[PDB]
Design a protein around this ligand. Structure first.
Ligand SMILES: O=C(O)c1ccc(CCNS(=O)(=O)c2ccsc2C(=O)O)cc1
Length: 358
């Protein structure tokens, strides 16, 4: 813990927790590739259990970074191609709006307006097929971006089909185990519940509810230590010894589409470094309920750029998470909290910390 990191982290996060009334928080800073950990407050207010480096937080849409990397690993295995039609992996999807919609479009939210959430009514595999068959795109494929769990969720499910494995087993064996993320879970096992923080929403304790495509879109829980290790793996994929996983991480940071100053990867989003802080700060707003934005295709996709701000926000009803890193500077941050507080306050704190260290 060098005093400078200690000082910028406490100087930034202390007022963040006060203003946002966050019950519990863990932060990791990766600096010159080494992790430094900080924690505050309570994993479980009622039971007086503190946040520790072993506390599990719900990552919410940060889970989409794992789905994009797992998809990247399947491409690198030669199991799928992003240029494949969706129907190649789900031939029961016969409705003609699907002609021309590829795995790329599903992975990058550019299928033509798939909705943010899969309806609660949708449970069984037959419900899911009915839902997609009935879905009417607002736009031609590859023209507009509309962030959507029903889009990347479906990408994650289709992407593991040729493997033979369930999504969870594919994720454990191909991503969590090789990276030694041994306290990262799609389903929290009973032995681990003692570490699982409660989320707080309007001051009620809550955990994420089951739903269709939950594992694929928002269902991972992890510790600050594992998430530091996730950032390290994404900062420096060349250190990873599993050839397809290395390549997969690299593919998830390729630049597929541009809107404004942002580039869409698989799960990750990226901006050129140095970034305008107001551009990433205002650019995070899950207070715009639906922003549909025109995309320009990057033909062909640019390979992972080292001078990028690579990041992802994520929330559940009770949790707020943020991950950001700059490959060229070997520098990153993870912030995990058990309240869903506004995204601009996350990116502002993250930028203030990494700016000061850069
Ligand atoms: O009980 C469920 O199945 C459930 C749980 C959490 C959520 C919110 C999870 N966050 S998210 O992936 O759906 C999302 C959506 C818009 S922003 C965002 C995020 O995670 O930042 C949705 C449904």
């Amino acid at each position: 813990a060098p005093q400078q990191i200690n000082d910028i982290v406490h100087r930034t996060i202390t007022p963040l927790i006060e203003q946002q009334k966050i019950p519990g928080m863990a932060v990791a800073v990766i600096y010159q590739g080494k992790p430094y950990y900080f924690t505050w407050g309570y994993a479980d207010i009622a039971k007086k259990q503190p946040v520790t480096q072993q506390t599990l937080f719900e990552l919410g849409s940060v889970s989409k970074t794992f789905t994009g990397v797992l998809g990247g690993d399947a491409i690198a295995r030669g199991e799928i191609k992003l240029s494949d039609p969706t129907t190649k992996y789900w031939p029961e999807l016969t409705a003609k709006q699907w002609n021309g919609i590829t795995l790329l479009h599903l992975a990058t939210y550019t299928a033509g307006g798939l909705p943010l959430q899969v309806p609660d009514e949708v449970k069984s595999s037959s419900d899911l097929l009915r839902f997609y068959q009935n879905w009417q795109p607002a736009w031609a494929p590859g023209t507009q971006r509309l962030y959507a769990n029903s889009s990347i969720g479906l990408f994650g499910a289709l992407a593991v089909k040729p493997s033979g494995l369930s999504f969870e087993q594919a994720m454990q064996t191909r991503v969590f185990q090789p990276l030694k993320l041994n306290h990262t879970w799609i389903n929290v096992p009973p032995a681990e519940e003692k570490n699982y923080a409660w989320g707080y929403r309007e001051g009620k304790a809550v955990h994420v509810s089951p739903g269709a495509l939950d594992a694929e879109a928002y269902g991972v829980k992890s510790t600050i230590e594992d998430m530091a290790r996730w950032v390290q793996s994404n900062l420096k994929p060349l250190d990873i010894n599993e050839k397809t996983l290395q390549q997969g991480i690299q593919l998830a940071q390729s630049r597929y589409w541009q809107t404004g100053d942002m580039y869409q990867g698989l799960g990750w989003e990226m901006l050129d470094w140095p970034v305008n802080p107001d551009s990433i700060i205002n650019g995070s707003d899950n207070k715009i309920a639906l922003a549909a934005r025109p995309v320009k295709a990057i033909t062909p996709p640019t390979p992972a750029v080292r001078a990028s701000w690579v990041h992802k926000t994520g929330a559940t009803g009770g949790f707020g998470s943020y991950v950001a890193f700059i490959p060229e500077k070997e520098l990153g941050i993870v912030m995990l909290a058990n309240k869903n507080y506004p995204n601009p306050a996350r990116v502002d704190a993250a930028w203030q910390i990494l700016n000061a260290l850069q």
